[PDB]
């Protein structure tokens with residue numbers, strides 16, 4: 001019986017034993033069909049939380065979830081399609097730069113993105129700051145664009161990893177999100193289902209990260225790298241710092257402006273370094289260089305020669321956008337009110353609580369609570385100081401870009417998020433580069 | 437919110453922390469109302485399975501479940517109402533003897549029993565072997581009978597510990613039955629809800645027991661004793677052997693005949709010793725003796741003088757039964773066919789698998805699979821040899837009492853259950869007597 005088979009699987013894992021591939025497939029298939037109840041799935045997840053899963057179990061779980069839905073076939077796109085996944089963070093504007101940059105060195109960027117919920121818009125929301133831009137292209141058009149220009153962007157497919165949509169939602173309401181085998185299989189399933197030949201992972205660490213400690217970020221990164229390599233989608237990872245927002249801009253059009261600056265070699269130093277580190281991994285994985293150092297050289301030349309920016313314009317143009325805005329980004333959506341937020345004392349910026357700066361930006365209209373909320377593409381925060389920068393009393397810490405006069409509640413959220421005290425060093429941005 | 441409060445409780449226990457009484461009450465109250473879903477309850481149960489609960493948590497859980505339903509008020513019955521609970525076992529015919537025996541030494545037996553599912557009938561099914569006997573008495577009648585005769589029996593009330601009915605059923609389908617805090621609170625809640633002033637626990641051990649190992653039986657017994665004493669329902673326990681069926685008779689009317697023999701001091705030695713051990717605890721708990729040895733003397737005198745048996749007759753008479761059957765038990769329901777089951781080789785009986793002998797008896801009609809099945813009160817097994825008894829090839833191991841000619845399938849089940857080999861000692865029946 002379904003009931004007894006699942007009771008036996010639950011007790012087996014509870015008792016510390018390894019599940020077979022067939023047992024894992026039976027669970028996922030049965031769960032996604034509605035044949036195995038949420039209450040048995042949660043019990044198994046909690047048993048997994050305590051007793052864990054080995055790599056073979058983790059791969060079986062990953063692939064069962066892949067096989068629950070759409071498997072996007074990118075085989076007609078020439079070359080090695082490498083995809084980057086970030087566990088997430090306030091100011092993470094890397095995808096905007098990485099797509100044209102990597103494409104500009106002949107690496108196919110077959111990107112599936114979204115809109116969604118969060119402090120700020122998803123990559124597609126940000127790109128829609130450009131008049132005309134859209135992602136309403138069909139399959140054959142996506143394939144053609146990547147073959148001809150090495151870049152294109154579509155939105156989410158309709159049925160990627162339904163077993164994971166269901167299980168993550170359950171994990172979130174039953175205390176079972178924070179378990180390595182469940183996180184690793186969850187993240188990796190979606191990237192594998194989306195068609196990636198190879199995967200680069202940006203695993204954040206620090207107070208603004210999912211994995212707050214370096215040890216936990218490392219554990220998760222290695223676990224995902226081993227899954228990918230085992231299934232034959234070559235995988236590498238970086239552990240990067242999120243003890244403060246990345247770059248300066250937190251918003252939609254504002255982040256697009258920063259991406260444009262970076263693509264001209266005039267962006268924030270942190271964002272530039274993360275881009276070059278992740279890009280270098282992507283270039284090597286795509287067999288467009290033998291070493292990270294060779295890859296980084298290619299990328300910097302692409303930026304310096306203008307090729308990176310020109311590729312961004314081609315990308316925007318090819319999907320309906322007015323690419324002349326890239327050359328004249330002063331014409332992007334501009335907030336009516338630019339309100340300086342000043343340091344209340346002199347010293348050094350020692351703390352910037354990322355998530356709360358994200359909430360502050362969101363409260364201006366930069367992001368959604370519900371799929372039905374509308375985003376204001378013009379609004380956000382631009383940080384004028386980062387951790388370790390000197391600041392004097394009365395100097396601007398950041399600029400608030402608002403389309404409303406009253407930003408009292410945004411200012412109080414920023415008040416809770418900034419600490420000024422005596423000198424500290426800038427935190428190290430790239431903690432670890434993982435190739436195994 | 438209900439959802440967030442419960443997520444926080446789940447994570448708290450998962451993380452190894454103690455739950456507050458209020459948190460436990462919120463869970464049980466919310467769960468029983470339908471406000472907290474099965475899938476959150478199961479996750480909490482699995483977290484409890486790994487992380488456990490201290491005594492204060494266990495008492496809060498026990499009492500929250502008590503408070504979910506009926507709390508039977510026995511205060512108008514004079515004296516200390518002591519109740520015995522057995523974790524269960526094939527041939528456990530102690531309640532039949534204990535009710536009249538203990539009553540006969542002036543201890544009030546306000547017994548709530550049932551019918552139910554199992555290898556054989558419940559205590560009420562067995563008593564219904566006597567023509568006329570019934571438990572259709574009201575509250576005031578039950579109270580009067582116990583005050584006047586020191587014994588009466590009713591069936592289950594309508595709504596005892598609904599939180600436990602719901603949680604045990606869930607535990608059984610999610611891998612969370614075998615956790616000490618959950619077992620202890622479950623068993624103790626029902627006994628406390630039923631009105632017992634004091635509780636005697638018969639915790640079985642061995643292959644025919646719930647708690648197969650002595651260490652596990654002990655752990656569970658002490659855990660229940662501490663719950664009871666903490667709530668002020670003085671509790672003691674015994675750990676008794678179930679490596680083979682207790683006594684000789686496994687059935688309904690057959691067990692009633694054995695109870696009658698024991699009440700005349702002519703019963704099986706094992707059943708007699710268990711009765712006297714449990715009875716002695718009950719007598720002391722009811723303040724009818726100062727020591728176990730004094731209690732045992734009282735009980736043996738009650739048997740020897742005829743008082744125990746006479747009390748059984750009064751009990752049966754007072755609830756409609758023909759008490760002359762107790763004096764002439766040869767008039768009880770008799771199976772048409774008595775089929776001897778003979779030893780296939782000489783030696784000593786070394787193994788009797790209790791549960792499978794129970795299944796064999798059940799297959800004759802002695803017990804129910806569903807609340808809708810009918811029991812045959814006449815049928816069952818009477819063992820003529822126990823572990824350590826000598827047997828010769830061709831001598832009767834047991835007698836099958838059947839109302840059908842074809843018992844081939846009962847005989848094959850018995851074949852799998854009996855081992856004859858070289859001499860062994862009878863196993864020790866009373867392993868431990870617990871008073872803390």
Ligand SMILES: Cc1cn([C@H]2C[C@H](O)[C@@H](CO)O2)c(=O)[nH]c1=O
Pocket residue numbers: 087088168177182183184186187210
């Ligand atoms: C931890 C985790 C996150 N996610 C996604 C959804 C989250 O809202 C987002 C950031 O943690 O990434 C998963 O899909 N699965 C996971 O296991």
Ligand SMILES: Cc1cn([C@H]2C[C@H](O)[C@@H](CO)O2)c(=O)[nH]c1=O
Pocket residue numbers: 523524604613618619620622623646
């Ligand atoms: C172990 C356990 C048993 N029981 C009852 C129902 C079982 O079918 C019976 C024998 O284990 O006792 C409980 O009510 N709660 C429990 O936790």
